[PDB]
Enzyme design. Structure first.
Site, PDB file in Angstrom:
ATOM      1  N   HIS A 139       0.849  -1.188   0.000  1.00 52.16           N
ATOM      2  CA  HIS A 139       0.000   0.000   0.000  1.00 52.16           C
ATOM      3  C   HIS A 139       0.879   1.231   0.000  1.00 52.16           C
ATOM      4  O   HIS A 139       0.573   2.247  -0.631  1.00 52.16           O
ATOM      5  CB  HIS A 139      -0.895   0.042   1.237  1.00 52.16           C
TER       6      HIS A 139
ATOM      7  N   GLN B  42       1.867   8.210  -4.084  1.00 52.47           N
ATOM      8  CA  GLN B  42       2.625   7.705  -2.947  1.00 52.47           C
ATOM      9  C   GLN B  42       4.051   8.238  -2.951  1.00 52.47           C
ATOM     10  O   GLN B  42       4.614   8.526  -1.894  1.00 52.47           O
ATOM     11  CB  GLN B  42       2.629   6.171  -2.951  1.00 52.47           C
TER      12      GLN B  42
ATOM     13  N   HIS C 273       4.928  10.489   0.118  1.00 56.54           N
ATOM     14  CA  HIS C 273       5.792   9.807   1.079  1.00 56.54           C
ATOM     15  C   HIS C 273       7.230   9.674   0.602  1.00 56.54           C
ATOM     16  O   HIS C 273       8.163   9.874   1.380  1.00 56.54           O
ATOM     17  CB  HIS C 273       5.189   8.442   1.411  1.00 56.54           C
TER      18      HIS C 273
END
Ligand SMILES: *[C@@H]1O[C@H](CO)[C@@H](O[C@@H]2O[C@H](CO)[C@@H](O[C@@H]3O[C@H](CO[C@H]4O[C@H](CO)[C@@H](O)[C@H](O)[C@@H]4O)[C@@H](O)[C@H](O)[C@@H]3O[C@@H]3OC[C@@H](O)[C@H](O)[C@H]3O)[C@H](O)[C@H]2NC(C)=O)[C@H](O)[C@H]1NC(C)=O
Length: 196
Positions: free
Chosen positions: A32, A87, A91
């Site tokens: 994920h 993502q 992140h």
């Protein structure tokens, strides 16, 4: 420098039950995310925003399988790579000193390959289709995470917590294990469903 890296693994059956999926849910954990973080406050959208380059070939095939973008059609996912891009910017941007786009995603794949949580759970007599205590799930995962993992639950139906994601933490250099902060999202007053 952030304090730790959290590898977040999704259980597809649960993800596709709580969200709309355009892909068939694999019968195995998928990535994920890989979140550089701090215990205090959540780290995200670090500056400067890193440019995202579209993956091709082997890396693309590897990511489509191990980091399948469940919310999008396969063609759109492989071509526009919406989730990988999101993502990376949200992140991946927080660990640019030690990693680049290629080594960030490469690390995620490497860390994922280190585990077979489905098999680990099975050897602990924890399989999809039934419910188990939080502690039993936690204990089983810790046998491979070494340090405390983070068992994340979701309640699609109020009162029915289910295994949604599992987080495993590592040191910033990903050379050692690290204790994940406990999200305490699972109602421990009842068993946790492991969706088939
Ligand atoms: C559910 O997902 C898990 C995780 O993805 C699956 O387990 C992994 O499955 C792969 C593929 O079968 C397997 O890959 C093989 O790895 C060995 C070496 O493995 C050891 O060393 C790795 C690096 O040091 C380490 O990460 C591992 O944990 C092991 O300690 C290689 O020698 C093989 O060649 C093979 O590697 C693959 O080769 C093909 C290439 O395209 C691919 O990129 C490469 O990964 C993993 O070892 C295995 N991991 C574990 C922990 O067992 C699991 O099978 C899935 N469930 C099912 C039923 O499919």
């Amino acid at each position: 420098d952030f304090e730790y890296l959290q590898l977040v693994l999704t259980w597809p059956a649960s993800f596709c039950y709580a969200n709309h999926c355009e892909r068939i849910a694999p019968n195995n954990f998928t990535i994920h995310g890989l979140w550089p973080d701090n215990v205090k406050t959540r780290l995200h959208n670090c500056k400067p925003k890193p440019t995202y380059s579209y993956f091709t070939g082997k890396m693309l095939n590897d990511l489509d399988k191990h980091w399948m973008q469940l919310k999008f059609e396969q063609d759109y996912g492989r071509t526009e790579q919406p989730s990988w891009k999101y993502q990376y910017i949200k992140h991946g941007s927080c660990c640019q000193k030690r990693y680049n786009q290629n080594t960030y995603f490469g690390l995620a794949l490497r860390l994922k390959d280190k585990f077979d949580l489905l098999r680990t759970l099975q050897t602990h007599r924890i399989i999809p289709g039934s419910s188990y205590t939080f502690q039993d799930i936690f204990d089983a995962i810790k046998t491979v995470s070494q340090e405390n993992p983070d068992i994340k639950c979701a309640e699609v139906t109020k009162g029915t917590p289910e295994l949604y994601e599992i987080g495993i933490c590592f040191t910033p250099n990903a050379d050692s294990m690290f204790r994940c902060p406990q999200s305490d999202t699972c109602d421990k007053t009842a068993k946790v469903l492991f969706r088939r």
